[PDB]
Design an enzyme around this catalytic site. Structure first.
Site, PDB file in Angstrom:
ATOM      1  N   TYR B  27       0.618  -1.131  -0.153  1.00 28.75           N
ATOM      2  CA  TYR B  27      -0.018   0.015   0.082  1.00 28.75           C
ATOM      3  C   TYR B  27       0.787   1.464  -0.058  1.00 28.75           C
ATOM      4  O   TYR B  27       0.111   2.352  -0.443  1.00 28.75           O
ATOM      5  CB  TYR B  27      -0.957  -0.139   1.251  1.00 28.75           C
ATOM      6  CG  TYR B  27      -2.182  -0.912   1.160  1.00 28.75           C
ATOM      7  CD1 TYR B  27      -1.741  -2.446   1.576  1.00 28.75           C
ATOM      8  CD2 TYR B  27      -3.121  -0.600   0.485  1.00 28.75           C
ATOM      9  CE1 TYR B  27      -2.904  -3.352   1.344  1.00 28.75           C
ATOM     10  CE2 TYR B  27      -4.235  -1.641   0.318  1.00 28.75           C
ATOM     11  CZ  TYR B  27      -3.840  -2.866   0.770  1.00 28.75           C
ATOM     12  OH  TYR B  27      -4.822  -3.868   0.778  1.00 28.75           O
ATOM     13  N   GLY B  29       2.693   4.256  -1.266  1.00 26.67           N
ATOM     14  CA  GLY B  29       3.084   4.902  -2.201  1.00 26.67           C
ATOM     15  C   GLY B  29       2.340   4.516  -3.656  1.00 26.67           C
ATOM     16  O   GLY B  29       2.150   4.865  -4.860  1.00 26.67           O
ATOM     17  N   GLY B  31      -0.611   0.871  -5.047  1.00 22.19           N
ATOM     18  CA  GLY B  31      -1.369  -0.418  -4.888  1.00 22.19           C
ATOM     19  C   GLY B  31      -2.588   0.238  -3.923  1.00 22.19           C
ATOM     20  O   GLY B  31      -2.616   0.950  -3.251  1.00 22.19           O
ATOM     21  N   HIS B  47      -4.061   5.292   5.646  1.00 17.10           N
ATOM     22  CA  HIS B  47      -3.858   6.673   4.660  1.00 17.10           C
ATOM     23  C   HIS B  47      -4.697   6.713   3.573  1.00 17.10           C
ATOM     24  O   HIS B  47      -5.511   7.474   3.209  1.00 17.10           O
ATOM     25  CB  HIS B  47      -2.447   6.826   4.375  1.00 17.10           C
ATOM     26  CG  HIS B  47      -2.402   8.159   3.928  1.00 17.10           C
ATOM     27  ND1 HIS B  47      -2.076   8.313   2.596  1.00 17.10           N
ATOM     28  CD2 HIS B  47      -2.413   9.138   4.472  1.00 17.10           C
ATOM     29  CE1 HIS B  47      -1.873   9.666   2.157  1.00 17.10           C
ATOM     30  NE2 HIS B  47      -2.074  10.108   3.522  1.00 17.10           N
ATOM     31  N   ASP B  48      -4.710   5.540   2.844  1.00 17.48           N
ATOM     32  CA  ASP B  48      -5.327   5.080   1.348  1.00 17.48           C
ATOM     33  C   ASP B  48      -6.916   5.250   1.617  1.00 17.48           C
ATOM     34  O   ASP B  48      -7.674   5.966   0.981  1.00 17.48           O
ATOM     35  CB  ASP B  48      -4.939   3.900   0.872  1.00 17.48           C
ATOM     36  CG  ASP B  48      -5.549   3.582  -0.443  1.00 17.48           C
ATOM     37  OD1 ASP B  48      -5.163   4.144  -1.543  1.00 17.48           O
ATOM     38  OD2 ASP B  48      -6.282   2.555  -0.617  1.00 17.48           O
ATOM     39  N   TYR B  51      -7.963   8.929   2.408  1.00 19.76           N
ATOM     40  CA  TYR B  51      -8.051   9.789   1.016  1.00 19.76           C
ATOM     41  C   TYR B  51      -9.164   9.409   0.270  1.00 19.76           C
ATOM     42  O   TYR B  51      -9.826  10.254  -0.261  1.00 19.76           O
ATOM     43  CB  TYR B  51      -6.712   9.458  -0.104  1.00 19.76           C
ATOM     44  CG  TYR B  51      -5.588  10.403   0.296  1.00 19.76           C
ATOM     45  CD1 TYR B  51      -5.409  11.102   1.378  1.00 19.76           C
ATOM     46  CD2 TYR B  51      -4.798  10.556  -0.658  1.00 19.76           C
ATOM     47  CE1 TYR B  51      -4.388  11.992   1.701  1.00 19.76           C
ATOM     48  CE2 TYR B  51      -3.424  11.123  -0.219  1.00 19.76           C
ATOM     49  CZ  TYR B  51      -3.480  11.953   0.566  1.00 19.76           C
ATOM     50  OH  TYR B  51      -2.307  12.769   0.961  1.00 19.76           O
ATOM     51  N   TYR B  67      -2.795  22.645   1.890  1.00 22.16           N
ATOM     52  CA  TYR B  67      -3.841  22.998   3.228  1.00 22.16           C
ATOM     53  C   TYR B  67      -2.719  23.528   4.051  1.00 22.16           C
ATOM     54  O   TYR B  67      -1.597  23.894   3.809  1.00 22.16           O
ATOM     55  CB  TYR B  67      -4.288  21.617   3.615  1.00 22.16           C
ATOM     56  CG  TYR B  67      -3.082  20.513   3.879  1.00 22.16           C
ATOM     57  CD1 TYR B  67      -1.861  20.772   4.615  1.00 22.16           C
ATOM     58  CD2 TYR B  67      -3.234  19.508   3.112  1.00 22.16           C
ATOM     59  CE1 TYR B  67      -1.178  19.544   4.890  1.00 22.16           C
ATOM     60  CE2 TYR B  67      -2.305  18.073   3.224  1.00 22.16           C
ATOM     61  CZ  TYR B  67      -1.209  18.429   4.104  1.00 22.16           C
ATOM     62  OH  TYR B  67      -0.361  17.491   3.976  1.00 22.16           O
ATOM     63  N   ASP B  93      -2.718  12.940   6.450  1.00 21.77           N
ATOM     64  CA  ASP B  93      -1.409  13.307   6.032  1.00 21.77           C
ATOM     65  C   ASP B  93      -0.814  13.310   7.723  1.00 21.77           C
ATOM     66  O   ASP B  93       0.178  12.489   7.797  1.00 21.77           O
ATOM     67  CB  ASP B  93      -1.306  14.375   5.422  1.00 21.77           C
ATOM     68  CG  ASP B  93      -1.201  14.362   3.718  1.00 21.77           C
ATOM     69  OD1 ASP B  93      -1.890  13.194   3.350  1.00 21.77           O
ATOM     70  OD2 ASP B  93      -0.864  15.322   3.165  1.00 21.77           O
TER      71      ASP B  93
END
Ligand code: NA
Ligand code: NA
Ligand code: NA
Lengths: 119, 119, 119
Positions: B27, B29, B31, B47-48, B51, B67, B93
């Protein structure tokens, strides 16, 4: 910005694809460590160091920053209307494009195994 | 935006390169599937998912959205002046940067074969 | 822009991840040369050629250009309010999303070795 760097490359090395430079060695297009594999890869390492220096300017984001330059076929110039971040980024892109034009391209360093070659 | 996430990471894990996190596990960066390889990879999976939730806000594009945040050396804060999309992305983030700081980094999960490890 | 292309894909192929298309064959998500590996890869080659044509418009940067389109669930339309660059890019993304929906996906062409398959 990314597209302007791509076009600078097309100005100086019209025969190669932007993709040939996007995944080469330990530093071209990706990676920030290890021993550079050849002279072309060294060009990419210098470019990476150059972008890190430009990022010290508040809000300066290299791949996203638009700048003023010109390719008068083969020849590259960063125009005087650029702000600090733009001018810096333009310089980094210019020097790399010219560096890429002189360095030989070793087909064996394309799309390499980062774990195996990059320290 | 991408550069601000990179800087958040530099705030919390000053010793590692942004590149060490850009191609890790299933995952980090890249995939979006398979079983996370280790705790660090789980941070990237969360994190994915984060988002994807922010993308439900009309016109919210995480890697491109700027931001307001601050790193008071080691410490991260998302500032109150952010709109919905910004605030959400900043939160995603922030939590990941802190998650990355605690998880051990397994050199063997770097730049892996997605076909071989990711379901 | 990149996120809008991702959403177009989600409109037409709701079951697959954007990541399944981000690293496939010789042309999907990366690479600009070699013989396309299968029909899906051909879709990506046509899309790549389409973006190169749009880049001829001054200041037109595909992955960064925002456009007006709509997905009325399954159905895609590029809206009439788009400028030349936007309309072109929107068309390229639309045709590819529809192309991806019809082509079979060969799991064996995912995350391949560019050196071994791409001429
Ligand atoms: Na040398
Ligand atoms: Na654990
Ligand atoms: Na066929």
């Amino acid at each position: 910005n990314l597209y302007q760097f791509k076009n600078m490359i097309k100005c100086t090395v019209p025969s190669r694809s932007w993709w040939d430079f996007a995944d080469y060695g330990c530093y071209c297009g990706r990676g920030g460590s290890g021993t550079p594999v050849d002279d072309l890869d060294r060009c990419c390492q210098v470019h990476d160091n150059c972008y890190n220096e430009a990022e010290k300017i508040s809000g300066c984001w290299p791949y996203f920053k638009t700048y003023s330059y010109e390719c008068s076929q083969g020849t590259l110039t960063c125009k005087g209307d650029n702000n600090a971040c733009a001018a810096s980024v333009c310089d980094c892109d210019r020097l790399a494009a010219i560096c890429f034009a002189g360095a030989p391209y070793n087909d064996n360093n394309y799309n390499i195994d980062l774990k195996a070659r990059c320290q």
